[PDB]
Design a protein around this ligand. Structure first.
Ligand SMILES: NC(=[NH2+])NCCC[C@H](N)C(N)=O
Ligand SMILES: O=C(O)CCC(=O)C(=O)O
Ligand SMILES: [Mn+2]
Length: 347
C-alpha cells in the first residue's frame, strides 16, 4: 500500500514543508516510491497526453519511424528497438527532450543530443509541452521538499535544474503475444526524479530498498544497473490508481545523497491488453555536475549531460543519432564544452 501525498502549490520552507520533505524521504527509504495526488488540471493534461499517444500509435509504422532526428534522441522508438541489458524491450516510445531548433547556439555548436523534437503534429506537440510544464512544476516542488527533508538549503537541487534537461518517454506496451512477458527489463533511470503516469492496465513493478543489498552505481561504466535483480524478489506491483502520479529517485539522487536515497529499480511486464504510460525525468541542466552532498571532501562528480549521452548511446546503439555522435566525434565536443561553453549555465 503506497503512500499518497498532496503537495503544496508553492514550497516556502515552513514547518509543514519540512515535515512533508521528511515524509517523502521516509517513503522512498521504505517503499522506493510514493504517489502524489493530482488536481483536475494535472489530471486533464495527463489524460490528453495519453489520448494523443494512442492516436499517434495508430499511425503507420513508416510514418512513426520518420519521426526521428540525427541531432536529438527525441522521437520514435519502435517495439523491439531499445536494448536494456542486452535484450530488446517491447514498448513503442516517443521521447521528448528539450526542443531546440537549428537556430539555437548549442545546436549550431554540435552539442550531443541537442536538436528539435520531430513532433508528429502540432496537436501532439501542444499536449506534450503542456503536460511537461505541469510535470516540471511538480518536479521543482519535490526537489525543494527533498532538500528541506535533508536539512539542506531549499535551493540545493533546484540550483542544478535551471534550464534542466527534462525529458519524457511516452510509451505504449503491446499486449503479450508470444511466450515473452518482458516489457522493459530491470533498470534505473538517470536524473533526479522520475514522475510517472499510467492507464488502468497495469504492469509496472518497482524494487524497494533492501537492507544490506549492494546497489550498482549506474553512472559508472563498470556498474550498470540494467538487468540487476530482474528475477529476484522483492518486486512491488504499482497498482493502477486514478488521480495520482508516482515518484521515485533516479541515479543523480542516489549519487548526491551517497545512497541515503537509491535510484529505484523498476521493470514492466506485458499484460493481456496494450498499456499506455508516460515517464517524466526531472533532470539537471545538461552542463551541471552533480556532487556528493554529505562528503564535501569527496572528489567524485557526475557531469549530467555526459551520463545522459552515454545512456542514450547504450539504449540505441544503431540509431541515426548515435551514428552521428560517433561520426562527428560529438562526445569529444562534450569534453570541450566542459571548458569553453558560452551558455552561462555554469561557471
Ligand atoms: N530511460 C531510458 N532511456 N530507458 C529506460 C530503459 C533502460 C535503458 N534501456 C537502459 N539500458 O538503461
Ligand atoms: O511503463 C512505465 O510505467 C514506466 C516505464 C519506464 O520505466 C521508462 O520508460 O523508463
Ligand atoms: Mn525507467
Amino acid at each position: 500500500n503506497l503512500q499518497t501525498f498532496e503537495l503544496p502549490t508553492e514550497v516556502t520552507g515552513c514547518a509543514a514543508d519540512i515535515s512533508l520533505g521528511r515524509a517523502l524521504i521516509q517513503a522512498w527509504q521504505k517503499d522506493g516510491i510514493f504517489q502524489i495526488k493530482t488536481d483536475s488540471e494535472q489530471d486533464r493534461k495527463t489524460q490528453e497526453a495519453m489520448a494523443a499517444s494512442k492516436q499517434f500509435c495508430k499511425e503507420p509504422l513508416t510514418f512513426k519511424s520518420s519521426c526521428v532526428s540525427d541531432l536529438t534522441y527525441s522521437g520514435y522508438v519502435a517495439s523491439g528497438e531499445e536494448v536494456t541489458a542486452g535484450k530488446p524491450d517491447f514498448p513503442e516510445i516517443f521521447t521528448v527532450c528539450k526542443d531546440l531548433s537549428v537556430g539555437d547556439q548549442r545546436v549550431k555548436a554540435g552539442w550531443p543530443c541537442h536538436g528539435p523534437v520531430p513532433w508528429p503534429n502540432n496537436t501532439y506537440q501542444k499536449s506534450m509541452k503542456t503536460f511537461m510544464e505541469e510535470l516540471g512544476l511538480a518536479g521543482e516542488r519535490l526537489l525543494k521538499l527533498t532538500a528541506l527533508g535533508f536539512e539542506l538549503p531549499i535551493n540545493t537541487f533546484t540550483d542544478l535544474t535551471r534550464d534542466g534537461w527534462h525529458h519524457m518517454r511516452v510509451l505504449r506496451f503491446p499486449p503479450q503475444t508470444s511466450t515473452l512477458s518482458r516489457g522493459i527489463g530491470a533498470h534505473t533511470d538517470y536524473g533526479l526524479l522520475v514522475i510517472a503516469a499510467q492507464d488502468d492496465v497495469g504492469g509496472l513493478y518497482i524494487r524497494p530498498p533492501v537492507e544490506g543489498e549492494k546497489r550498482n552505481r549506474n553512472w559508472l561504466p563498470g556498474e550498470s544497473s540494467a538487468g540487476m535483480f530482474e528475477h529476484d524478489e522483492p518486486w512491488t506491483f504499482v497498482t493502477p490508481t486514478p488521480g495520482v502520479w508516482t515518484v521515485f529517485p533516479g541515479d543523480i539522487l542516489q549519487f548526491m545523497t551517497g545512497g541515503q536515497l537509491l535510484s529505484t529499480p523498476h521493470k514492466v511486464k506485458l499484460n493481456t491488453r496494450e498499456r499506455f504510460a508516460c515517464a517524466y525525468f526531472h533532470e539537471p541542466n545538461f552542463e551541471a555536475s552533480a556532487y556528493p552532498l554529505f562528503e564535501p571532501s569527496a572528489n567524485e562528480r557526475i557531469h549530467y549531460g555526459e551520463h545522459f549521452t552515454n545512456m542514450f548511446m547504450r539504449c540505441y546503439p544503431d540509431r541515426i543519432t548515435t551514428q552521428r555522435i560517433n561520426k562527428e566525434n560529438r562526445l569529444a565536443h562534450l569534453e570541450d564544452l566542459k571548458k569553453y561553453s558560452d551558455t552561462r549555465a555554469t561557471g
